[PDB]
Design a protein around this ligand. Structure first.
Ligand code: BR
Ligand code: BR
Ligand code: BR
Ligand code: BR
Ligand code: BR
Ligand code: BR
Ligand code: BR
Ligand code: MG
Ligand code: MG
Ligand code: NA
Ligand code: ZN
Ligand code: ZN
Lengths: 156, 160
């Protein structure tokens, strides 16, 4: 059964800016993310992106402002051979108290896979809580202390 | 030292067929496999040098600020992924300028002419790139997305 990696976007795949990648000039890739995701794919992991984008589609974060950098990030990954099976987004504000905001598991219900060998990889405590809620492993990404080369090595 | 002298537009990234200049982020697109293949080439001992004509860069026809956004992002992607260019050599002149530095002229790479000529290459998509190689006394590889792409180059230049 399938090994999955459920991977956070902001602060994990790309750098976390006001916490919104709403301009092209705010886009920056995390070190080693491409070669390591390629390594992880070769080892048999399928990749799923999962992200909370607070207030996506509002005055404070229009969909168009999100789309440009996001679509470009996706181009870059895809052209280099990194493929995400799905990109799962919660667009809600915390105050909305919605059903889909990480660490709630709604976005990933369908997956609820080889649980023993699947991971959430993200840079926040809420990513680790998502792993607990899904009943799978959690890796707390840190650019300095638990980064892409380390994860690539560990999981292969 | 073995070097790869690599074109930018149409080689590392796609080249826009309207004005042939990446002056907006929506005109930036990486060529397939360029990142893993340059990493492979680096691991085999190649050093990388970027060499590019950017016609009219820094003038109203191609403002510096317009080039800088996509170019700096491109460079951030390379650097963050482990791809290091020793130098990025740019000719900003128009053809009519008759400058000393426009490819296939060798002025920009004069210091390299220094290197292992038998194992060094120019990689680019145009006749201009192949002519640069000849002018440098080294091999030229004509990049084509289908017939001589990044995976093929990665394999070819690491063949033992
Ligand atoms: Br790496
Ligand atoms: Br998040
Ligand atoms: Br894509
Ligand atoms: Br165009
Ligand atoms: Br590749
Ligand atoms: Br050129
Ligand atoms: Br050739
Ligand atoms: Mg994050
Ligand atoms: Mg070219
Ligand atoms: Na060009
Ligand atoms: Zn939500
Ligand atoms: Zn010039």
């Amino acid at each position: 059964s399938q090994k999955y990696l459920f991977i956070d976007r902001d602060g994990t795949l790309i750098s976390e800016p006001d916490f919104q990648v709403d301009r092209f000039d705010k886009l920056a890739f995390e070190p080693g993310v491409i070669p390591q995701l390629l390594k992880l794919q070769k080892a048999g992991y399928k990749l799923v992106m999962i992200t909370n984008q607070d207030g996506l589609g509002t005055q404070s974060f229009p969909q168009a402002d999100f789309d440009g950098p996001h679509n470009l990030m996706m181009q870059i990954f895809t052209s280099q051979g990194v493929q995400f099976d799905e990109v799962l987004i919660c667009p809600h504000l915390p105050a909305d108290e919605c059903d889909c905001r990480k660490p709630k598991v709604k976005l990933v219900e369908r997956y609820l896979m080889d649980r023993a060998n699947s991971y959430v990889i993200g840079d926040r405590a809420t990513d680790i809580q998502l792993a607990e809620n899904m009943g799978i492993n959690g890796l707390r990404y840190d650019r300095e202390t638990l980064n892409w080369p380390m994860i690539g090595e560990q999981l292969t």
